[PDB]
Design a binder for these strands. Structure first.
Ligand SMILES: [Mg+2]
Ligand SMILES: [Zn+2]
Ligand SMILES: [Zn+2]
Ligand SMILES: [Zn+2]
Lengths: 554, 97, 171, 88, 112, 178, 107, 270
RNA sequence: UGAUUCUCGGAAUC
């Protein structure tokens, strides 16, 4: 899967170390600068300016190039770029914490506001639990607003011991849009309000003690508070924000590929004001802009309304939106995907299929396939299916040799030729008795998905046995059902050995069978029973011939 | 056709491990990326031809693994990175337990 | 200098060879993928000692194809030069920029300016050589060099060494 | 750690029987190998289906496999098809 | 005695229907809710805040928000969770994969 | 695929302390004085000096030709030819390195007996000296305590000049002829 | 053990944990009128020695934290007077098997 | 929700129910270790009935003319009457069947004697019947020692947990306890010989099966119980198409949320 | 709910 051999050893993931990016690593990683805000056009001349997407980064147009990394599109994951911001911005999401953190430490010096010296504090420092430590720490020191230089130790409340210094009063803080402000109280009166410049906050976080990081739910290696503020900006590669070219002389740039363009724009304009006629505070009207676009690009569904609508009224899917539950990467593309080797049509009952059988129309049997591996046990049966072509029923449509290459049976000028080679794989049609998984959504049972024996049949319906009805909880009032075809010898095994219908007969949810006899067969079995009911020879002979296991003894 | 959440749930109940894994992978995404044996990232600049592997920044060429994951997952990670979050991929356990 | 380090390699065996003489094909392939190797972290893998008692342990079966993977623990003889090490070998090639001596599987080269001045380069010689007051160095001539630096690469390790100190030269 | 994570053949606690998951998986796995052109350890009395052969190999307990039963804490127990009783 | 009520109550909700569930299930749930300490709710408020991995709690209601403070707190994930491996594309420690299988080269010579 | 060593060091992201290599007895972290044996026990690094190595090799290279035939049923310029065969019978043949390792290792060898090389080892191994030095002293012909303490600069203070000289004498003695 | 009638002044109670080793507990009258332990619904619990506990762990291959917990302020926890770290063994009836053995550590 | 809440839960190889951290949720899945699929509502005869009817059914007195087994039942009948060494095992049994009666009246205060239990004994005997064509006429050939000793012997193999120690081996008795009672309830001497005339062979067979049938009814380590238990409750919830309290569906919602202000707070005091 | 078909919103089905 992925195609092409790689001398790289392969292993399975066993741990996920979460963290935040270090502005430096962002550069280390980056393979492209990204200084231009445009797409390409070397002055209309189609290509890609060493500016945005592909200044070395991933590619488009079906061209190997990817910093010789070649491979061309398929095989080449994207290659992150970066973009040196002009001034430090918050991280739309971390803002709540960047804040709560400030209320836990003081400015000017940058150290805790409660040492082992304060007792109610010690207790919180024993709570081994990054989440509940930082959740007790905050509740304690959010109240004390003065960087105490001397406190009464484990002795007399008369003897004052010392530690750090500079009691500079601590301003309480509150949130407003994408900025943090606080008031400093002076006695004698009246407050003093000022905005906390990012550059300032960031600074106070760098100084924070290495053991302070820790005590406050962080990690010296992976996530240092000083990283919740963005210096350098990782620029996702094409495959994350693919374009969509409508042939050639047409655009199609993704949504994301735009906010970068905007973030990039509102950045270059900022710098051009810090090295030119700097009307000082006509910049924070264009700096508050960068804080915005780089807030949006990640999250667009905030409290302080301004939706940042693309030119058209369309909201603009933020990165967060892509992941957000249901229909989104996590719940939509990873916890549940669309799969191949599946089929769905209309179900109809048929009192002529063993419980575990399931009728598959020839149409579908000739569409769905199963990779069999050319073994001397079937080299014959297989060369037959292969010659049979992909049109007659018992046949096949694809033969794949060791040299990882697929021969298309319905075109290949050698379709009728071909001798097979042990080890080759021949994709054949689903044949009578190929364990399959059948089911009917909404699935809330172990039972809603069972393994059946394939029974190819004419007419376009999934012909299931009656008694296996109630388990899927279906009827034929125009109902549909899904069928999935196993793909590895060991897979079928799992279906046939645990999933098979005959196994699901006694249900563990009520420690009693879950399939019985219904409708006709039920109704008729009562009539046929009665003392009153009698049957004569000529017919009691046809009935005996109908029980397949009849010992031949009238 | 879709093998959405609820479909998963049933297979998990059945205990049909291999199969579930097979629907999600071989019959869908299934992709092969490269990782740094050091920083659990996808930086890895494998030219898979002249065997060259590198990964400057972490600066490697000797410790590099290859893994199989759903392309939608490779994507999940890449998206998280662009939001400045680091999802590490480690091929061995160290926390124990 | 030479070493005997304890190593272990992971081989993935295809179901095909799951026969009776497996232990055999396992070993055999170990030897095809080790003896002759070259890492910057182990240098030159030269030979696996104690063939008879190589440990295979139980291999586990990967889960999509039958392939079973064994973590073969072994022991063998290696040699990776070092900077500030002193070894002697036989010169092979030699030009206007110096000669290249051959200590074992490796090849150490010496700059025309990393030797002594009273030692020049003789072009009109056959075979090419370097003359001195009393010394004459060419092809077969046995030297004794001091390895100044190492540069690992591909499946070989080269290094430059000097003969400007004392007790370094011919023998 | 562990040879320390490997409980001895003695002192073994787990069920002397094979779990349906194990059985299901051994058969599966073996089939997948028999299908891969692996060696067959029984007399194919004319059989030609792998998952079939596996059911036979598993019926004379001539399957060269070993199940490693991990415990909630890492330490594990090792059992072979040969040992495990196949009631089911 | 609380668990006793919680269970008794949940049972009386399935019973007022005239249906039937075998103790064990109602018990397991009544227990998952109880063990931790008191009455852990089955909502984004309770259970989805425990020590379970990030990627797991992640696939249910809080998604991004959870992932965020999961890299901020430099969390580590065992990959012991079902969800974990589903996202990764690896067989999960479930029934079929609750163990490992190995060719005992030893017995593989006694069979011939 | 590659090959690992018996020692699981926990490389937590910051891979930036790659010390240098010098006969300051500072060899890559891979060859510390204390390394780990497969048995799981600690064991002193294994330092082979030319010739003593030619024997280790030749020994296993031979006892291999033996176990390569158990399952087959079902003088200087002279050893140059005798070892060229033991290769083309128990080697890959394409291991052009080992061919060169045995020539070099068979030419510059300082001994011929597993007895002689045994005494050399017994002798040198009562110094308290590091296995790398111990090695070097066995493969490099030294006459002076100055030629020694200069071609193996890690010695300098570890052993008096006379001592090392006595031992230097004893070597040129056991030093088998040609 | 102290039994207050209507309440103890918040000035008073902040003097309990200040004389170690020995410890003290506050109970209300109206909260001891009836014994909760005698309730149809409450199963009998039992303390465990630092022996029977260090054993329970080793016998199930458990790390202290994987054990079902019981509130320090739990009605019953106070009745027996548990302590952060101690282990109770709860034995109750069961419609599946006569009796069931469950353990609760204390947080 | 119920599903995402119990995903990770499964019976581990030790027979404990844990999750992804490995936190013990139940020490023995279902307080008995039995797979739901192998259970049928059996009846504990030991509970129901009057104290009088009980004696007439399980009491055997070898020291009495009218309370001994009639020699028409056992082969070694007459030659057994009065024996004192037998009346010790015969009484040792009875003291147990009565300790049982008291125990069951403490777990099931209702008196409901019908509960789900592994291994259907009612049938297992019936099949024993007509499998050995046993005639309700002629006498058995089981010694009293044959019966009571083999019964106490069976309980030794009904292993749920294996453990090589006290803590574990103690849980064993626990998880089995309830079953056993039912087992002694149907394999008491009087019953075995008078109710269902078994032979020596018939018996040794019924025993062998109960044992085998039991070990099959144990839960398999690997069973993803959580998800199972999850669905099993959330499904009979979609089949809910609807003395004046808070009904069902809205109630269930109420419960799982652990809501403080429930519509009906009520409270029954006896 | 979940899924499907429709044609980024609307429609449909059980
Ligand atoms: Mg319908
Ligand atoms: Zn590329
Ligand atoms: Zn300060
Ligand atoms: Zn890296």
């Amino acid at each position: 899967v992925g195609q092409q051999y790689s001398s790289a050893p392969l292993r399975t993931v066993k741990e996920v170390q979460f963290g935040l990016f270090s502005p430096e690593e962002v550069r280390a990683i980056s393979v492209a600068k990204i200084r231009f805000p445009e797409t390409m056009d070397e002055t209309q001349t189609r290509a890609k300016i060493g500016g945005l997407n592909d200044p070395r980064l991933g590619s488009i147009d079906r061209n190997l190039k990817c910093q010789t990394c070649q491979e061309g599109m398929n095989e080449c994951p994207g290659h992150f770029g970066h973009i040196d911001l002009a001034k430090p911005v918050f991280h739309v999401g971390f803002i709540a914490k960047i804040k709560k953190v400030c209320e836990c430490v003081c400015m000017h010096c940058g150290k805790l506001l409660l040492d082992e010296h304060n007792e109610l504090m010690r207790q919180a420092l024993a709570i081994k639990d990054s989440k509940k430590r930082f959740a007790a720490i905050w509740t304690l020191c959010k109240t004390k607003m003065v960087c105490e230089t001397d406190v009464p130790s484990e002795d007399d409340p008369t003897q004052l011991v010392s530690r750090g210094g500079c009691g500079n009063t601590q301003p309480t803080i509150r949130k407003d849009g994408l900025k943090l402000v606080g008031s400093w109280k002076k006695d004698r009166d009246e407050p003093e309000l000022r905005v906390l410049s990012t550059e300032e906050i960031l600074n106070i976080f760098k100084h924070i003690s290495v053991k302070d990081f820790t005590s406050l739910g962080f990690n010296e290696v992976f996530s240092r508070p000083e990283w919740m503020i963005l210096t350098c900006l990782p620029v996702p590669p094409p495959p994350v924000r693919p374009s969509i070219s409508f042939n050639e002389s047409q655009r199609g740039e993704d949504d994301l590929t735009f906010k970068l363009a905007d973030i990039l724009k509102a950045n270059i304009s900022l710098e051009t004001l810090e090295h030119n006629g700097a009307p000082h505070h006509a910049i924070e009207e264009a700096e508050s802009l960068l804080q915005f676009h780089v807030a949006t690009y990640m999250d667009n569904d905030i409290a302080g309304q301004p939706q940042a609508l693309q030119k058209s009224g369309r909201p603009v899917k933020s990165i967060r939106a892509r992941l957000k539950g249901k229909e989104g990467r996590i719940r939509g593309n990873l916890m549940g995907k669309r799969v191949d080797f599946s089929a769905r049509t209309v179900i109809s009952g048929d009192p002529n299929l063993e419980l575990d059988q399931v009728g598959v129309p020839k149409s579908i049997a000739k569409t769905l396939t199963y990779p069999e591996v050319v073994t001397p046990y079937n080299i014959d049966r297989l060369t037959q299916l292969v010659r049979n072509g992909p049109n007659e029923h018992p046949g096949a449509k694809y033969v794949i040799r060791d040299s990882g290459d697929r021969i298309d049976l319905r075109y290949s000028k050698r379709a009728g030729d071909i001798q097979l080679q042990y080890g080759w794989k021949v994709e054949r049609h689903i044949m009578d008795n190929d364990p399959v998984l059948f089911n009917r959504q909404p699935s809330l049972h172990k039972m809603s998905m069972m393994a059946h024996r394939v029974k190819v049949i004419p007419y376009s319906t999934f012909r299931l046995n009656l008694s296996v009805t109630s388990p899927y909880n279906a009827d034929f009032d125009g109902d549909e059902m899904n069928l999935h075809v196993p793909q590895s010898e060991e897979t079928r095994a799992e279906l046939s050995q645990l999933c098979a219908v005959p196994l699901q007969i006694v249900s563990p949810q009520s420690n009693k069978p879950c399939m019985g006899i219904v409708q006709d067969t039920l109704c008729g079995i009562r009539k046929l029973t009665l003392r009153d009911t009698f049957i004569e020879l000529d017919q009691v002979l046809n009935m005996l011939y109908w029980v397949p296991d009849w010992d031949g003894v009238i | 056709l879709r093998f959405g959440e609820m479909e998963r749930d049933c297979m998990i109940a059945h205990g049909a491990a291999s199969f579930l894994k097979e629907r999600l992978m071989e019959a869908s995404d299934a992709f092969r990326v490269h990782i740094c044996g050091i920083c659990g990232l996808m930086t890895v600049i494998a030219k898979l031809n002249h065997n060259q592997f590198e990964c400057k920044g972490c600066d490697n060429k000797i410790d590099i693994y290859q893994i199989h994951i759903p392309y939608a997952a490779k994507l999940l990670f890449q998206e998280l990175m662009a939001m400045n979050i680091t999802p590490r991929l480690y091929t061995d356990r160290s926390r124990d337990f | 200098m030479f070493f005997i380090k304890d190593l272990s390699l992971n081989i993935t065996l295809h179901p095909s060879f799951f026969g009776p003489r497996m232990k055999q094909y396992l070993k055999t392939k170990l030897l095809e993928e080790v003896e002759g190797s070259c890492t910057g972290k182990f240098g030159y893998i030269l030979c696996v000692l104690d063939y008879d008692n190589i440990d295979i342990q139980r291999g586990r079966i990967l889960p999509t194809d039958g392939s079973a993977e064994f973590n073969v623990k072994y022991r063998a003889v290696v040699f990776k030069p070092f900077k500030g090490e002193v070894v002697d070998g036989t010169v092979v090639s030699c030009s206007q920029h110096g000669f290249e001596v051959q200590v074992g599987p490796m090849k150490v080269f010496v700059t025309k300016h990393l030797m002594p001045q009273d030692l020049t380069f003789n072009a009109g010689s056959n075979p090419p050589s370097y003359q001195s007051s009393e010394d004459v160095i060419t092809i077969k001539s046995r030297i004794r060099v001091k390895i100044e630096g190492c540069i690992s690469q591909v499946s070989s390790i080269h290094a430059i060494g000097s003969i400007k100190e004392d007790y370094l030269g011919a023998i | 750690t562990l040879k320390e994570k490997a409980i001895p053949k003695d002192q073994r606690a787990t069920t002397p029987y094979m779990t349906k998951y194990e059985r299901a998986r051994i058969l599966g796995t073996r089939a997948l190998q028999i299908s891969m052109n692996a060696p067959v350890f029984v007399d194919l009395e004319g059989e030609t289906d792998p998952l079939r052969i596996a059911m036979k190999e598993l019926a004379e307990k001539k399957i060269p496999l070993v199940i490693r039963r991990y415990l909630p804490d890492g330490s594990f127990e090792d059992w072979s098809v040969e040992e495990l009783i196949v009631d089911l | 005695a609380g668990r006793a009520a919680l269970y008794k109550e949940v049972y009386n909700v399935i019973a007022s229907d005239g249906s039937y569930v075998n103790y064990r299930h109602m018990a397991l749930l009544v227990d998952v809710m109880t063990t931790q300490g008191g009455l852990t709710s089955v909502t984004r408020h309770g259970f989805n805040r425990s020590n379970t991995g990030a990627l797991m709690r992640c696939s249910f209601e809080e998604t991004v928000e959870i992932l965020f403070e999961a890299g901020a707190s430099a969390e580590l994930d065992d990959c012991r969770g079902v969800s974990e491996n589903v996202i990764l594309g690896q067989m999960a420690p479930i029934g079929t994969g609750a163990f490992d299988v190995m060719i005992d080269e030893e017995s593989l010579v006694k069979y011939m | 695929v590659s090959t690992s060593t018996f020692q699981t060091r926990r490389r937590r992201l910051k891979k930036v302390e790659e010390e240098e290599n010098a006969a300051t007895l500072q060899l890559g972290q891979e060859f510390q004085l204390k390394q780990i044996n497969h048995q799981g026990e600690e064991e002193e690094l294994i330092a082979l000096n030319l010739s003593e190595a030619r024997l280790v090799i030749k020994e296993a290279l031979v006892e291999r030709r033996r176990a390569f035939k158990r399952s087959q049923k079902k003088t200087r310029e002279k050893e140059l030819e005798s070892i060229d065969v033991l290769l083309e019978q128990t080697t890959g043949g394409n291991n052009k390195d080992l061919k060169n390792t045995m020539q070099y290792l068979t030419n510059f060898s300082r001994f011929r007996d597993q007895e002689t090389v045994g005494a050399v080892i017994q002798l040198l191994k009562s110094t308290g000296l590091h296995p790398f030095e111990v090695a070097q002293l066995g493969s490099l012909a030294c006459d002076t305590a100055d030629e020694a303490k200069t071609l193996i600069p890690s010695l300098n203070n570890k052993i008096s000049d006379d001592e090392l000289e006595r031992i230097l004498k004893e070597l040129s003695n056991l030093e088998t002829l040609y | 053990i102290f039994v207050y009638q209507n309440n103890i002044t918040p000035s008073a109670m902040k003097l309990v944990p200040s004389i170690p080793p020995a410890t003290i507990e506050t109970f209300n009258e109206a909260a001891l009128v009836v014994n909760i332990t005698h309730h149809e619904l409450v199963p009998k619990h039992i303390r465990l020695s630092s022996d029977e506990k260090r054993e329970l762990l080793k016998r199930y291959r458990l790390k202290e934290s994987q054990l079902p917990r019981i509130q320090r302020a739990d009605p019953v926890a106070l009745y027996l007077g548990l302590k952060r770290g101690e282990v109770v063994k709860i034995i109750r009836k069961s419609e599946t098997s006569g009796r069931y053995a469950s353990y609760r550590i204390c947080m | 929700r119920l599903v995402k809440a119990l995903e990770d839960i499964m019976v581990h190889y030790d027979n404990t129910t844990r999750n992804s951290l490995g936190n013990v949720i139940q020490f023995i899945y279902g307080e008995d270790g039995m797979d739901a699929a192998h259970i049928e509502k059996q009846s504990l005869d030991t509970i129901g009935g009057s104290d009088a009817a009980f004696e007439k059914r399980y009491r055997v007195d070898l020291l009495n003319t009218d309370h001994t087994l009639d020699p028409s039942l056992l082969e070694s009948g007459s030659e057994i009457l009065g024996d004192l060494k037998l009346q010790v095992l015969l009484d040792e049994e009875y003291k147990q069947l009565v300790k049982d009666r008291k125990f069951l009246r403490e777990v099931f205060v209702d008196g409901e004697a019908n509960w789900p239990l592994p291994v259907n004994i009612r049938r297992i005997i019936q099949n024993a019947q007509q499998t050995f064509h046993i005639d309700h006429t002629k006498p058995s050939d089981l010694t009293i020692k044959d019966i009571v000793l083999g019964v106490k012997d069976l309980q030794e193999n009904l292993l749920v947990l294996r453990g090589k120690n006290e803590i574990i081996q103690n849980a064993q008795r626990d998880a089995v306890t309830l079953f056993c009672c039912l087992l002694r309830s149907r394999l008491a001497t009087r019953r075995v010989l008078q109710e269902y005339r078994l032979t020596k062979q018939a018996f040794d067979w019924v025993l062998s099966n109960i044992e085998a049938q039991f070990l099959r009814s144990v839960v398999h380590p690997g069973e993803m119980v959580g998800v199972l238990a999850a669905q099993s409750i959330g499904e009979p919830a979609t089949q809910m198409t609807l003395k004046k309290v808070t009904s069902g569906v809205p109630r269930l919602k109420e419960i799982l949320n652990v809501a403080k202000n429930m519509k009906t707070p009520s409270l029954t005091v006896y």
